[PDB]
Structure 1
């Protein structure tokens, strides 16, 4: 049937599988995996069933206004809408200044979209109030990498999976969250059965079903566990002194310079027999974890939300790196510290392009006077135009919306009224009578649209062109396969017309399409350690993604960052084979972080840990996966997971209707009793819009990354 195959990227997870979308007569009819991308032709079922979502008629295809708060959404023209948008933002600014205005974006936006909004607000309007949902996700992985290595992003690649002989998979349901990457790990263990897999997770998930050891520790005690692993490694003389002596520095519990002995002495508080009681695991689990890690030829750590969605999130990341730094399981094939990114483009679009409140493009920081000036030069701005202090991070943002400090917001390609924590607070805030909320949303069933005053019809996925950078440093292009339905426009063009109508200088948004913003972004990255100037449209069009740094058109891309002769940011004549160039002395850092717990720990009143999690069939709020009937049959509705032992003595049977209750709300859900949750933990999924679980969660944040702790709060269960 297809007359034509069009190269692109899977719309869903940060595995970043390349696709070929097959079209006939301007209509998509088939999809398959791109044989030349890292995924080597393969897709998971969500991926293979993207054509029904592309072809869905349940779309926002014309602009919409709500004339009054609580009113009905009515058709409006593009010009009226665009004029309503420009004048509201413009004059909010005229009245209250730049900071009364905000951008809430997404790691699902095209890099070019995020790049342009980041420039309108930070260079156009003079506010740093630009954030987005990677704050809710990767913020802790950004703090971990920066503090340990001085730069963001992994130093290795997905190819490293094919060469690890040990996998330490922690706070990660890879099976369900990163399905085609879970298959590469499983394929590795199968080509080489001597490969060891440690899954460190309070829940017993399908990821543990390929594991040699499933460590089901008490929620919040993984920092103690990983300090204990370090103790075992140094105790049994399994460290790499040649490496940590030449390439590592040590910072004690009070954050002061230290040394190996200082490290040894701090770790003495983390003896296996002590920590086993704390973690609630058998003591031999620490020794065997530690041993598999240090003793193996090449060890890869992989982690996701169980580590990051924590108030001790950045410290938890530093602890995985402490493990690689102490053993030298880094900077060589198969051995690496590898944070899993969840979204298709948290990495390229918003992390790398600094579309967060405290950051500037391509490794730059807003408090750094020199960076500001060097962005002002590159964007052709007045001096002092970029504000010196960071805008609102996401929790602070929506607190300000409620206070009325932020009066205008664009919410783009995210669903904050379903996915922000402590939703009774958030809903309150989003219903401020004097807020003007603009939503750019493809799907009319997004629960956020209920708060929207203006709704814009956006071109969806491969209805336009753009770049996604996935978790591997690979930036891949999606070309346009089909026309947008109705009056849907690409968000890049929408953002330029808005900017212009709002008096933004025409030089600032001098883009006719995404290719032009790409060429400008290529320049903003040139000479930095993200340098991807060689990644021209022409070769993104032909290659199946390039991996950065990629500094010239004859550069292949970079696999091993910080390795001499591999990474172009390491000078060929550098005295040393590694160079952790994000730190002033080229050494990476071990941090001796105090192990603590959740912001809301269980107690007599609320004796249970409660967690939230991914299920395989659904993507977040289900506005997309919910349109594929195949993906409903297994998981149509929300449920609560309960431990067998816990349920056996609370008198709860399987499929009993139970009430889950925290300090913030109470919710009725069908119970699902099994060994999946360790004794003392319950778990809810967050896809069902009729069961808004983030009503139950606290929104306490990590004080460095400002990532919320969606992963732990205290709860109790009673039969309904």
Structure 2
């Protein structure tokens, strides 16, 4: 500690602590404008409002910037310092617009001016720049700017989106976007970090201002909850006025530390959309079911009639029970939700396995990471991530393969960019497409689509042959390395360079760089897993991690990113066909008998069918009744023509949703449920973080809680359930989920988030796992070599283009939620596809023109966007557009082990339209 004297008193200062921080901790508040005491914001010391006097120095010092030293004497109450601070505030007030009609009359600046008794300036005003309202989500009014640079720090050092700069000189210094372009037409991604940082109201949410850029809307209350979209798991503070969410701010959660993306900050609007279901619906007993059926959500009376809750629940449960008691127990199935809470998932799987009496329960994880999970279970006997994404800060080398984190996990990507900028981490990106992140990458490998195994095998060959592996780790914590050493012989970089499209020298350099680093961390996403050979790719990644020993230490491990906000928690609750809760196999007699005693009812011992197998069985007439909750297979399933045929072939389909989705078109009964912001429960993020959600607003009309609806269905299926709410369900689940040991509803409410596994009710959990071995029979991980397998469908003269599908920043999956959010809708209004400019020239197209996209399975028409990140010979398209549904064209062929379709590669043809 650095002991010194402050204002005539003897005090002691912790290391790395400024004078301002010491004074604040001791109660003496010093005014500040450009300093923001929050994580990630380095003090700049430019506004000069925090000046103090240091004995033995000619001029005054900025307290927010200076750290104390032994023997120093600091005085803040002197007439010199107070006069200087007052004059700085008066100079700034001279240029401010009139407070009562300003863009934020209660800004931090005005509060500081109130503290210093400065309300008017003796100095004349200067006319500044005009308003900029080009961006729909945020408003720029730089006539109230004080040039503190907090927005510059927010964009460039915290988020590292690199949009804002401070351009000119002297009093003409100006906040600019790109080349001083309008915000709406710039590279801005609308993360909103600058808005949250700005202390004057120069930058504001557009929803707070009227047409004259005044009078910030004033919320009645603020509620702390989570983001409903992706697996990063940001904590959010929702602002409510007149029982409506109007704006959202980031909260200092362990995952995000006050950071958000556009969907978290501005995408809350869907809960208030007029298409929200308010009453139960029952299909009219006149309208047949068809694959090409269409229902207007604004006018559903063409196909449906409204019903009471009792009548609709009776119809749904009666249809299911009649099918069960006439056609047998194997004629039923259920699709759960990865967007609901852990309690709802537990109740859903319990309902299927007890009321339906079968193991046919599954959700979107079958389409997400099934092959990766299969490889990881074969190798390590576990499917969990081995490190959080925050471990990237401790990693010398970071590998991102088949993932686009600046689009699909933006906050985690900000932490990766922090690692690169502040700690010198070397980032290697392996992806056929260039990305926004590529400019920061030490190397970007742009291999040909579908050829991951060749490149990874070449890297393994380099490591094995040149003797760069960890012999000590291999002999002691792995097995079967001799088989890999024998197999890897035929995968030299020279042979594989033509197959993968990456030169041999680059492959050798990357392999050496990964092996020789002190700590390396691998992230991977859908580009690796969504192939018929995705398990092979995951095996290659696992072997790379195992032979070099880069696992089980800080800054190391394997992190396959979790997509949905609660895919991990739903998997943990047993919402998958092959295991009970906590990944206990339904085939073992011991597990089955334990659950038969716990639930007090005999259980089916056979493994269930997966999502695609279920759709096949529906198409064949084996499955007759289906219950779907929180999923939209009519847009997310592959080969939508046959999938919609199968859905329309059902005898009885019950749908529990927020809107009349494309799946609900074929339903017999539709039950209106509650959105994320209206419910309580627990959700588990990509880092094994269990976090608690709180209701922000009430459900509209007569909509009901998801858990209540499932309880009603169970009670009508001859089950005696009486749950008070989510907390009781949590207690019951914790009785049979050892991974929840020392985690309780009370502790969760008190703390907000706990990482599992955790060994005590007062200690934090283990972020890093596998430090002492693996949960296998022998405790050692098994290396499984991989071989080259071609894609199921490859281009020919008939269909010469490679079609790949994915995501855009502003939209979620099927578009059911994000297209109903006004800001997100405005940002991406129309269906588009991406292609390289040279390909547009060769095909005879123009940017923004229409084209017809065709495969062997379907045809669509949409607009084309020219993109230089797309390789020659590829067309990339999101599946979020109902007017041109990408899954009308995709290949339903499956990975033999993972049972995942090949969304990422098929053959297509393009023609002008």
TM-score (ref. length: structure 2) = 0.73
Give the distance between the partners of 1:466 and 1:693, measured in 2 at CA.
33
| Cα pair 1:404 1:435 within 8 Å, conserved | no
Match of 1:568 in 2: none
Alignment partner of 1:538 out of 746, 755, 780: 746
SS of 1:455's equivalent in the other structure is strand
Alignment equivalent of 1:343, drawn from 561, 564, 573: 564
Contact 1:662 1:716 in 2 (8 A): yes
Asked if 1 retains the 8 angstrom alpha-carbon contact of 2:805 and 2:876, the reply is yes
Q: How much has 1:680 moved relative to structure 2?
A: 2.0
Between the aligned partners of 1:447 and 1:711, the Cα distance in structure 2 is 23
Distance in 2, matches of 1:375 and 1:676, equals 52
Question: What residue number does 1:554 align with?
Answer: 762
The superposition leaves residues 253-286 of structure 1 with CA deviations (integer Å, 9 ceiling, x where unpaired) of xxxxxx33x3222112111111110012222231
Determine if contact 1:102/1:130 at 8 Å carries over to the other structure: yes
Q: Name which of 893, 899, 902 aligns with 1:700.
A: 893
How far did residue 640 of structure 1 move?
2.2
- 2:868 counterpart (669, 675, 687): 675
RMSD: 1.7
**Aligned counterpart, 2:303:** 72
| Residues 1:628 and 2:628 aligned together | no
Mapped partners of 2:849, 2:489: distance in 1:
46
**Partners of 2:267 and 2:823 within 8 A in 1:** no
CA-to-aligned-CA distance 1:364-400 (integer Å, 9 cap, x gap) = 1122222222222232223xx2x22222211111122
Q: Counterparts of 1:501 and 1:87 in 2: how far apart (Å)?
A: 8
Task: Return the alpha-carbon distance in structure 2 between the equivalents of residues 81 and 419 of structure 1.
Answer: 27
> Judging changes above 3 Å, is the alpha-carbon distance between structure 1 residues 279 and 645 closer, same or farther for their aligned structure 2 residues?
farther
**Alignment counterpart, residue 248 of structure 2, candidates 31, 51, 55:** 31
CA contact (8 A) 2:224 2:694 kept: yes
Inter-partner Cα distance in structure 1 for 2:349 and 2:592: 14
* Range that drifts further, 333-342 or 390-399: 390-399
**Structure 1 CA distance for aligned equivalents of residues 728 and 810 of structure 2:** 37
In structure 2, the CA distance between the partners of 1:552 and 1:25, relative to structure 1 (3 Å rule), is farther
**Which structure 2 residues correspond to residues 91-110 of structure 1 after superposition, within 5 A?**
91-110=322-341
Q: Is 1:314 equivalent to 2:314 in the alignment? A: no
Secondary structure of the residue that 1:519 maps to in structure 2? helix
Matched, 1:513 2:730: no
TM-fit CA distance, 1:551: 4.8
State the 1:320 CA deviation: 1.1
The SS at the match of 2:901 is coil
Q: Structure 1: how far apart are the matches of 2:760 and 2:736?
A: 14
Aligned length: 682
For the residues of structure 2 that align with 1:5 and 1:289, how far apart are their CA atoms? 49
Partner Cα distance (2:503, 2:398) in 1: 20
Q: 2:691 aligned with 1:479, yes or no?
A: no
User: How far is 1:604 from its partner?
Assistant: 2.6
Q: Is the 8 A contact 2:340 2:676 kept in 1?
A: no
Aligned residue in 1 for 2:461: 231
Q: Secondary structure, in 3 states, of the residue corresponding to 1:332? A: coil
Query: Unmatched 5+ residue regions in structure 2?
Result: 1-217, 290-301
Q: Which of 614, 617, 621 is 1:397 aligned to?
A: 614
Q: Give the C-alpha shift of residue 322 in structure 1.
A: 0.9
- Find the partner of 2:883 among 677, 690, 695: 690
Mapping 1:247-646, distance limit 5 Å: 247-250=477-480, 259-260=481-482, 262-349=483-570, 351-382=571-602, 385=603, 387-432=604-649, 434-444=650-660, 446-504=661-719, 506=720, 509-526=721-738, 531-563=739-771, 578-581=772-775, 583-646=776-839
Is residue 2:428 matched to residue 1:201? Answer: no
SS of alignment partner, residue 85 of structure 1 = helix
Which segment drifts farther, 458-467 or 117-126? 117-126
Change in CA separation of 1:153 and 1:11 when aligned onto 2, cut-off 3 Å: same
- The residue number in structure 2 matching 1:112 is 343
Q: For residues 442-500 of structure 1, give each alpha carbon's deviation from its aligned partner in whole angstroms, at most 9, with x where no partner exists.
A: 123x2212111111110111211011111111111101222111111111111011111
Determine the structure 2 residue equivalent to 1:211: 441
Distance 1:354 1:679 in 2: 43
2:478 and 2:780 in contact (8 A); partners too? yes
CA distance in 1, matches of 2:850, 2:266: 33
Residue in structure 2 matching 1:18, options 232, 235, 250? 235
How big is the shift at 1:20? 2.2
Q: Name which one, 1 or 2, has greater alpha-carbon Rg.
A: 2
Q: How does 1:46-61 map to 2 (within 5 A)?
A: 46-61=263-278
Tell me how far apart the structure 2 counterparts of residues 493 and 629 of structure 1 sit (CA, whole Å).
30
* TM-fit CA distance, 1:709: 1.0
Higher relative contact order (CA 8 A, sep 6+): 1
Asked if the contact 2:268/2:821 (under 8 Å) is kept, the reply is: no
Q: Structure 1 CA distance, aligned partners of 2:865 and 2:510?
A: 30
Q: What SS is found at the alignment partner of 1:356?
A: coil
Contact in 1 for aligned 2:269/2:822 (Cα 8 Å):
no
Instruction: Tell me how far 1:160 sits from its aligned partner.
Output: 0.7
Conserved? CA contact 1:223–1:316, under 8 Å? yes
> Which of residues 133, 145, 161 in structure 1 aligns to 2:364?
133
How far did residue 104 of structure 1 move? 0.8
1:565-618 Cα offsets, whole Å, 9 max, x none, are xxxxxxxxxxxxx1201x111011211011213211222322221100110011
CA distance in 1, matches of 2:610, 2:742: 33
Aligned 8 A contact 1:103 1:410 in 2: yes
Q: Tell me whether 533-542 or 367-376 shows the greater mean CA deviation.
A: 367-376
Q: Which residue pairs with 1:575 in the alignment?
A: none
The answer on whether the counterparts of 2:232 and 2:255 sit within 8 Å (CA) in structure 1 is: no
Alpha carbons 1:401, 1:435 under 8 Å: kept:
no
Report the Cα offset of residue 97 of structure 1. 1.6
Contact 2:282–2:670 (CA under 8 A) maintained in structure 1? yes
Residue-by-residue CA offset, 1:507-537 (whole Å, 9 max, x unaligned): xx342211111111111112xxxx2122111
Structure 1 residue 26 displacement after superposition: 4.3
User: What SS does the aligned partner of 1:167 have?
Assistant: strand
Residue deviations 1:197-246, cap 9 Å, x none? 11111111223232122111111110111111111122332211111111
Listed one character per residue, the Cα deviations across residues 56-95 of structure 1 (whole Å, up to 9, x for unaligned) are 3330111101123346121111000011111111121111
Distance 1:296 1:117, change over 3 A: same
Q: Distance in 2 between matches of 1:675 and 1:24?
A: 44
1:398 alignment partner, SS class:
helix
Over residues 334-385 of structure 1, what are the superposed CA-to-partner deviations in whole Å (9 max), with x where a residue is unaligned? 1111100110111111x21221122211021122222222222232223xx2
Contact 1:641 1:676 (C-alpha < 8 Å) held by counterparts: no
